[PDB]
Design a protein around this nucleic acid. Structure first.
Lengths: 621, 647, 237
RNA sequence: GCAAAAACA
């Protein structure tokens, strides 16, 4: 409650936080009793002098560090939980102040410190009288009677007696009002006591049906899915330029080329080429960032939101209804197989430059040999070059994102072959990109060198002709807006190499486990279901197409793809189980194919994986 | 997909790691979460009766239902009270040591819990500033609120904090003070009840985005108490998904003339079919059969009753389109598919008595499932973590196995668990299964990560970034997710990314400055050749270079100097361990920083243990400063002059 | 004393400009150790590239031994900020320190390096091993220390005057002497936070789940990432 | 235009 009158204030806020009184059974009474004990200590340790310092020093409610100091100076050491209340330099004895119900039944607590006994109305044990002096006894009697009159005034005799005879007990109390608040939304009390007898009923259930044949996925019907990715993939090419810096190569390309459009898309107007030529020469003279031209307005979507809002406000009318979004279902495009067969094509260079780690032991040598051989087998492939292109483009675009600008920045995609020459894949132009949040979409105009054009595959791209030293190339311009998260993710696209490598190692090491001898040159016969027939092939080509699939899945990752993969892990497990002559049983209303089919809407690689699953046998003998 | 399914030299289980979308952008949730929140809230009401009747379920307080009401051909929300009682009693009779350890935790460790651990929580809704603040700020403001409105100092223990909350709930009027925030018992009750909902970001493996809810700081102490008790129960039972257990069951062998099957499955609408009153009954049975006092039962039952009265925030509005226009409108203004819940709208929040939310009671739900497992005729091996489970049946007959599987499904339905039929697969001769991203095939359990390691520097400083990247790769190797080749390749990729991020590649300002001033590259972040190898992941960068002679002694003395102006992570302090980089909150921040700065100098022991030492900060600092001054073995007059200035 | 005087006006200044801050309980320190307004970002690695390239990346304490401009290149912002090349500058034309300080700081890290290079490797055996993850102590320690007594052991080493007899009793006597004789060059007001970390790692016996083909001694546990795997096993003598 | 059940421009 509040401060008792007989207890001094300073003692009260000293005792305020010595112990957590609120979670004690009689915490207020215990606090008052402790205040009594400390006050008795203070009146015992009144102003005195033994040899220049008071003979009585107080240890109660003092910081343990100073108590330890004072004990060290006196060559004594007391435990924390049995520290005496006070210490006397007269006899050099530690006294603990105790309150007891009666004086006759009082035994010493321990031999390491003496006990001062009081009976709550002033009288003290004869040991106290022999130890202390008359004035101290009179003062303690006065304080004790002034406390006892307070106890009788508030009728706390039972609580005081309980506090004296025992230690603190823990509790947690909930009042009536909070209890009524708790009981508002439940049919039971705070401690639920339902009257029903504990019993578990017998409930009729359905049966479990065997999955005799594997589920067949549904191929969607509709227009074929166009190529929807940040860059071009297998159709990307590069222009060979004389050795030098990026600026020299850009100047070489700009000064010795001309652009004429051959295919124009409404999504990417043919006028936006004026932007690209404005950023080439600007980069040719050493300025990666240029000013704003008129053609940028329709190329980077500047002030598009306000115009769209104005048009909608001035045109739309009727009655408010729910959004009811929809996603257009699309079929498997023919270009996925072409992308697969082209991404694995052999290359003259390695395209995978990674600094070798150190070697200190033979395990390190084994690991480095495995990594080097994997780099050899998946390096001279088109997919590796496209991975490096994506890495460079995403990295250079991401490095220019955080710095807020209002001007167009050019980020050339240039690689160095192991001969010094420059390889120009394209140029990505970044708009104002007032990116406030990590999911905000920065505008981009991507010009990229093509290998072959296809209106069906690239409906939103604008294809121009490019003449450099009597050499013909295709230049594709695409207007996109792309997020910082996705650009950062594709700036570390090289991690896609991890998943195939695992498989490769998991084969090679396995062969070692078959003979306790590493080979690092094994190219075993992996048997697969190809074109609907069980036939074998080499490990290297299989790893190459695994890397092609993983790259395609990575660049085409979306909620549909992740849902499809997560729900297809179960079907893959079931198929592997049915290879091993194991039966698969299924719940009553169970259709594992439904979860997968929910995820097959318009993702070209999800559809490609679905077709690959459907081409395999659905029944095993 | 046929390319991912080998038929020789390797099995599809090992190649199932290829069915993962690493190195690709994780889906991000855009715009309003109102539709997802409302759908999550409305699922339990449509699932209470076999024939959907939302109106008749919207006036149900306790989700208790008869066995005939249970939907065996579809999801069922609610529980059978007698079933919960008997199952909890059976779960108590078994697992005696686990409940003994719970008793020990209650008697000993529970009173010693400090509410300062609440400061280590994640984002909270501030009922004072009406914003989202980090856990330390919300904890500090809540403690100050309790101090002001309760006129006593809150003890460091968690029980003291909970008692303070329960006491402040008894006041007609509370204030916060200039601000002068005016409250009420009903307003504070609503603040306690309200759950703040948000999108679950960076979530993979799902077509549709999910939502996660946070409780208020007022109820978080009780939530932590009950969840800690749940941890102590779950860590001591063989059916929990926390250690191993999957590997142990995989290694288990059964005689030939037996039928062993393996059911791998998930749970549909795990949080949309669980009622907090079942958790109340389970906990009450546990504590009552443990012999705990009534205040223990009250303390354990408060959180779930506050959850029964939850006011989960329903986002920022449903999307309505007139023509090409788009608008956000709260539930109730115009007809929609959630009109049935219009009667439950309280301001921008909606009342919901049935159903849970994700990220609220992850372990009590697991406990409920595990007590549902305990039955006389379920003589199998069950391991469940949240909504994922694996079960091993060892029966003498196929019909017996099917009976046990159906009994398992029904007994989980008795409390509202509802395994998804399409996501549950039972392999008949066992030996193949999936559980918690771990694939079991023929007594081999392979761990597959949901997320690939970032393989990029974390962003603190070169030394810690290198150490943490190497530690992450080493951990991935230890879990089995990576091997020799993958480990070394990941190391090379991380080395390239680490060198690029610190301008250690090509020609940059840093490399140009090093070249002009003739500063040879001696560290990996400086452009030197990597010294770390596959076998050297735990070794420090500064070390292993002095040992190999790559770093002579005087440059070590130059860079290891503690007096340099710039200064588990086992990286030695060095000059390269640098640091890169709300009206009345920044001044309070800097004041608290200064107070923390005067400590850690006068109080070395807080660098090893907790603060303890009851008393005011000013008085403790003054006393310790004195103790230092007159333990400085100086002259007495100098000591007197020094204490003369302490005021 | 000058250094003791350096703890007075800071106390008086803190008590003056932050009155309500000192009025809080001393146990509140455990709460406001981490009191920060800054939101806990979801991915700090995203902005590292920008932060490093940002002008004046490093925040440095005020200093005099680092020039404002060195060889026609700005270093400090004249707390002040530092150029990205400042740590590179300090590696060649900086102030050295005692060899004992270097040895003490690198202690418990050079020990791991010495253990790695003082052990012999057997031939790699390839087979169908079954690595089962078992909880073992991750790193070898100078002396075996019961957990929950590590904080009491560290108190004796660093602040034996601010302790209790109860803490003294349940502290590993025998590892304190080893810690004192190897940490005393760095047991000052500076590197007090650091020296605790090295000392803690010296006697920390935490358990980690590691692949196991044969039962791991503490020496082999810290290097278990290459001793065993699904397909290979190397024996250590 | 990005994108996917609703946000960026």
């Amino acid at each position: 409650t509040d401060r008792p009158d007989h207890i001094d204030s300073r003692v009260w806020e000293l005792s305020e936080t010595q112990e957590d009184w609120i979670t004690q059974v009689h915490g207020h009474v215990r606090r008052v009793v402790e205040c009594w004990k400390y006050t008795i200590c203070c009146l015992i340790s009144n102003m005195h002098t033994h040899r220049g310092a008071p003979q009585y020093d107080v240890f109660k409610w003092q910081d343990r560090s100073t108590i330890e100091w004072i004990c060290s100076k006196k060559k004594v050491q007391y435990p924390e939980r049995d520290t005496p209340d006070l210490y006397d330099n007269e006899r050099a004895v530690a006294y603990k102040v105790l309150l007891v119900s009666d004086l006759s039944d009082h035994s010493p607590t321990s031999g390491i410190y003496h006990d001062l006994a009081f009976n709550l109305e002033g009288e003290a044990e004869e040991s106290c009288a022999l130890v202390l002096r008359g004035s101290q006894l009179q003062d303690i009697k006065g304080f004790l009677c002034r406390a006892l009159e307070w106890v009788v005034s508030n009728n706390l005799t039972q609580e005081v007696v309980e506090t004296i005879s025992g230690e603190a007990k823990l509790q947690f109390s909930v009042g009536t009002t909070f209890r009524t608040l708790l009981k508002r939304d439940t049919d039971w009390d705070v401690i639920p006591t339902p009257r029903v007898e504990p019993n578990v009923p017998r409930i009729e259930g359905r049966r479990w049906t065997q999955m005799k044949k594997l589920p067949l996925l549904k191929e969607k019907e509709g227009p074929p899915s166009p190529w929807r990715a940040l860059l071009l993939g297998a159709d990307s090419e590069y222009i060979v330029c004389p050795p030098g810096t990026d600026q020299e190569a850009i100047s070489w390309i700009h000064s010795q080329s001309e652009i004429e459009c051959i295919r124009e898309s409404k999504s990417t107007p043919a006028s936006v080429i004026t932007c690209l030529t404005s950023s080439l020469q600007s980069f040719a003279e050493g300025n990666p960032v240029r000013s704003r031209i008129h053609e940028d307005i329709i190329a980077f979507g500047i002030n598009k939101k306000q115009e769209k809002k104005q048009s909608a406000s001035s045109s739309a009318s009727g009655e408010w209804k729910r959004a009811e979004y929809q996603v257009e279902e699309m079929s498997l495009p023919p270009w996925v197989e072409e992308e697969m067969v082209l991404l694995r094509s052999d290359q003259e260079d390695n395209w995978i430059e990674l600094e070798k780690n150190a070697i200190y032991t033979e395990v390190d040598g084994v690991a480095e040999g495995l990594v080097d051989k994997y780099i050899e087998i998946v390096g001279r492939t088109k997919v590796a070059s496209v991975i490096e292109k994506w890495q460079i483009a995403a990295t250079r675009t991401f490095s220019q994102l955080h710095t807020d600008r209002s001007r167009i920045t050019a980020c050339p995609i240039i690689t160095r072959d192991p001969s010094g020459n420059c390889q120009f894949w394209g140029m990505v132009l970044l708009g104002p990109h007032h990116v406030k949040r990590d999911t905000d979409n920065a505008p981009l105009l991507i010009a990229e060198i093509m290998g072959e054009d296809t209106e069906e595959k690239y409906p939103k791209h604008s294809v121009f002709s490019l003449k450099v030293e009597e050499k013909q190339f295709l230049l594709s311009l695409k207007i996109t807006s792309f997020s910082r998260n996705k650009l950062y993710t594709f700036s570390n696209i090289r991690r896609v190499l991890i998943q195939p490598a695992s498989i490769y190692s998991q084969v090679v090491l396995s062969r070692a486990a078959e003979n306790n001898s590493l080979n690092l040159e094994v190219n075993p016969e992996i048997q697969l279901y190809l074109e609907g027939a069980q036939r074998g092939m080499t490990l290297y080509q299989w790893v190459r197409m695994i890397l092609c699939l993983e790259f395609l899945m990575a660049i085409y990752n979306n909620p549909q793809m992740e849902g499809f993969l997560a729900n297809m892990r179960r079907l893959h497990m079931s198929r592997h189980a049915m290879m091993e002559r194991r039966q698969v049983f299924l719940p009553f209303g169970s259709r594992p194919e439904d979860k997968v089919n929910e995820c097959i809407i318009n993702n070209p690689i999800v559809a490609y994986l679905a077709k690959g699953w459907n081409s395999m046998p659905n029944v095993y003998y | 997909m046929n390319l991912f399914t080998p038929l020789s030299e390797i099995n599809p289980t090992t190649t199932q790691e290829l069915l993962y979308a690493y190195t690709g952008p994780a889906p991000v949730a855009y715009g309003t979460r109102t539709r997802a929140v409302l759908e999550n809230i409305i699922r339990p009401y449509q699932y209470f009766y076999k024939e959907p009747n939302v109106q008749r379920a919207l006036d149900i307080k306790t989700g208790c239902k008869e066995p005939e009401d249970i939907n065996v051909e579809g999801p069922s929300s609610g529980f059978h009270t007698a079933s919960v009682l008997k199952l909890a009693d059976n779960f108590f009779r078994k697992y005696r040591p686990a409940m003994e350890k719970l008793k020990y935790w209650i008697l000993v460790k529970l009173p010693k819990l400090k509410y300062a651990e609440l400061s280590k929580g994640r984002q909270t809704y501030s009922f004072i500033h009406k914003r989202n603040l980090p856990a330390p700020i919300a904890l500090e403001e809540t403690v100050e609120f309790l101090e002001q409105n309760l006129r006593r100092k809150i003890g460091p223990t968690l029980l003291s904090y909970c008692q303070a909350i329960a006491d402040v709930m008894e006041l007609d009027e509370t204030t916060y003070e200039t601000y002068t925030i005016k409250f009420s018992r009903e307003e504070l009750w609503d603040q306690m009840r309200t759950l703040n909902t948000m999108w679950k970001h960076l979530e993979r493996g799902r077509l549709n985005r999910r939502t996660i809810a946070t409780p208020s700081m007022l109820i978080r102490g009780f939530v932590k108490i009950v969840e800690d008790a749940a941890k102590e129960i779950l860590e001591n039972v063989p059916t929990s998904g926390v250690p191993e257990k999957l590997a142990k069951l995989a290694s288990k062998q059964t005689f030939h003339t037996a039928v062993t099957g393996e059911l791998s499955g998930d749970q549909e609408k795990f949080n949309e079919c669980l009622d907090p009153d079942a958790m109340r009954l389970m906990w009450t049975v546990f504590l009552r059969k443990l012999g705990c006092p009534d205040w223990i039962m009250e303390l354990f039952n408060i959180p779930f009753m506050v959850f029964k009265s939850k006011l989960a925030d329903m986002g920022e509005g449903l999307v309505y389109t007139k023509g090409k226009l788009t608008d956000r409108k709260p539930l109730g203004e115009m007809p929609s598919e959630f009109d049935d819940l219009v009667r439950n709208v309280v301001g921008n929040s909606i009342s919901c008595r049935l159903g849970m939310f994700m990220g609220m009671y992850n372990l009590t739900s697991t406990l409920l499932a595990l007590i549902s497992i305990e039955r006389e005729e379920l003589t199998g091996s069950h391991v469940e973590s949240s909504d994922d489970f694996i079960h091993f049946f060892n029966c003498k007959t196929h019909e017996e196995m099917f009976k046990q599987a159906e009994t398992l499904r029904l007994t989980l339905k008795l409390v509202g668990i509802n395994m998804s039929p399409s996501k549950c697969i039972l392999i008949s001769p066992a030996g193949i299964g999936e559980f918690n991203s771990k694939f079991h095939h023929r007594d081999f359990v392979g761990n597959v990560a949901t997320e690939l390691p970032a393989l990029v520097p974390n962003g603190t400083n070169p030394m810690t970034d290198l150490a943490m990247g190497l530690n992450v790769i080493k951990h991935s190797v230890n879990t089995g997710q990576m091997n020799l080749c993958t480990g070394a390749l990941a190391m090379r990729i991380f080395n390239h990314a680490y060198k690029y991020a610190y301008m250690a590649l090509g020609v940059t300002r840093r490399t140009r400055f090093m070249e002009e001033n003739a500063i040879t590259p001696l560290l990996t972040n400086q452009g030197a050749s990597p010294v770390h190898s596959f076998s050297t992941m735990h070794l420090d960068e500064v070390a292993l270079r002095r040992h190999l002679g790559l770093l002579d002694e005087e440059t070590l003395r130059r860079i290891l100097n503690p007096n340099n102006p710039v200064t588990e992570d086992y990286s030695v302090p060095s000059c390269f361990k640098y640091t890169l980089s709300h009206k009345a909150l920044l001044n309070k921040e800097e004041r608290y920083q200064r107070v923390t700065s005067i400590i850690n100098k006068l109080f070395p022991e807080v660098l090893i243990q907790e603060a303890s030492a009851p008393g005011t900060v000013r008085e403790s600092l003054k006393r310790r400063l004195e103790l230092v001054v007159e333990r400085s073995d100086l002259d007495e007059e100098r000591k007197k002059r020094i204490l003369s200035r302490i005021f | 004393e000058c250094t003791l005087r350096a703890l007075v006006e800071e106390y008086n200044g803190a008590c003056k400009e932050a009155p309500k801050e000192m009025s809080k309980q001393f146990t509140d320190y455990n709460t406001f150790k981490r009191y920060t307004t800054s939101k806990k970002d979801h991915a700090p690695q995203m902005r590292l590239v920008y932060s490093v390239r940002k002008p004046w990346p490093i925040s440095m304490t005020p200093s005099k031994e680092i020039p404002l401009v060195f060889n026609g290149t700005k270093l400090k912002d004249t707390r002040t900020r530092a150029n990205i090349v400042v740590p590179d500058y300090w590696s060649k034309y900086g102030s050295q320190t005692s060899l004992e300080v270097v040895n003490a700081i690198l202690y418990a890290e050079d020990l791991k390096v010495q253990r790695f290079f003082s052990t012999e490797w057997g031939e790699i055996r390839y087979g169908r091993m079954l690595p089962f993850r078992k909880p073992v102590q991750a790193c070898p320690t100078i002396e075996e220390v019961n957990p929950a007594s590590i904080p009491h052991t560290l108190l004796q080493v660093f602040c034996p005057q601010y302790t209790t007899l109860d803490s003294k009793r349940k502290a590993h006597m025998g590892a304190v002497e080893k810690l004192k004789r190897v940490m005393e060059p760095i047991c000052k007001v500076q590197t007090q936070e650091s020296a605790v970390h090295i000392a803690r790692s010296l006697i920390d016996s935490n358990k980690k789940w590691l692949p196991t083909v044969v039962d791991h001694t503490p020496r082999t546990a810290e290097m278990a990432h290459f001793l065993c795997s699904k397909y290979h096993y190397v024996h250590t003598n």
